[PDB]
Subunit: 163 residues, 3 copies
């Protein structure tokens, strides 16, 4: 599945397999009828946004998140691009990456993804969410139930094609 | 385009350019009024799920498809992660990878993708599917017809923006 | 974000952050009610479709844009595949990279993307487009306003979850 990093609303960990929505630019478990943006994933073969949309790195970024380049001219007349230094950045500091921060989550946005399900979820039907757990509904397609629901677990697991 | 591997329902080859849907977790050619999940693609630059959701491999995976890591402690107290071997794994019996099996197909899920079209399909419009071949409809956007439909070809080709 | 290269209508340059649509298979700024396919992006990094649907290159492609491979056999019985050269390819022309051509644009299709906004755009709501600039509407989800709208600029910037 194809994924990006998002921060949780309360900074706490949302476990693998929960369906999430956005609230105030941050993720929380989705509730019924809310826009489901994706699922917390451990299988993402492609993850993105590890250094995206943060203006506290080594080089200065523009308002769109792009690196700002200076056009440098040499004495001969050769012109080349050089990134602008960020005054804030400390070359001798060890910054903590998103993968080591509990509030930052890999969210699968597209592809076949494992999802927590209740007892109502059926192969070949869609889903909605209650407390981040799939219930029978109209979003996406359930591919197969790989771990049947158990009363004593409180959930089962299905592969869902998320788009 | 961005793609994943899916298995065909009958275990036979679906040729490139056909629109596909899911039935019982496997792919077949899409028909009237069905959810079109994507297109068999030869142009995918990113392709995923080659070894996803394999619970009979060498390394143990959890119910969500993630690798289960042992927490290992050195004599000093230093801790690190180590994959857990699978008890149900048998190195004796044969295994051929998905990429080498005919039943496993690259399905483009997102991006500009070439699609088989009928005589009703028009640039700038959406498509539906009949026998996996695009017909004038409501899904996606036709970017350009690259091979016009002719009779006795039975199809033409268009680039479609699939999302 | 996940992005692909698209050619612009009339070879026009479209700056970062503008919402785009397709017209005759080429991109232009989106207007009210039009289908928004994505946003001009500087945050995509690695971008698909640099070679996709180029029937004017060094190797021959089939009608679906897939590379055509010839089956080669050696004297000693070994079989392998190799791309079929295009005999109508002239290496003397020195073809120019997609990135140095004004008409080719990186369009973010999926993920968290910075978008130009007007004064009506609100966190947690969707957007429509006027001259490629977001206005309050029904598409996507505004994650957060990172640069509030100002008179001095005539726009603000928000991170929008595009799917």
């Amino acid at each position: 599945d194809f994924a990006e990093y998002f921060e949780s609303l309360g900074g706490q960990v949302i476990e693998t397999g929960y369906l999430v929505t956005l609230e105030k630019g941050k993720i929380r478990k989705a509730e019924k009828g809310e826009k489901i943006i994706g699922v917390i994933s451990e299988t993402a073969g492609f993850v993105l946004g590890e250094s995206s949309f943060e203006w506290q790195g080594a080089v200065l970024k523009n308002e769109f998140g792009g690196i700002i380049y200076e056009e440098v001219t040499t004495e001969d007349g050769v012109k080349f691009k050089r990134p602008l230094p960020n005054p804030d950045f400390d070359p001798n500091k060890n910054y903590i990456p998103r993968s080591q921060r509990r509030e930052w989550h890999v969210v699968g946005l597209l592809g076949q993804i494992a999802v927590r399900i209740d007892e109502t979820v059926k192969q070949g039907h869609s889903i909605d969410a209650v407390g981040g757990v799939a219930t029978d509904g109209d979003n996406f397609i359930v591919q197969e139930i790989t771990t049947p629901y158990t009363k004593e677990k409180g959930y089962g697991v299905a592969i869902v094609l998320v788009k």
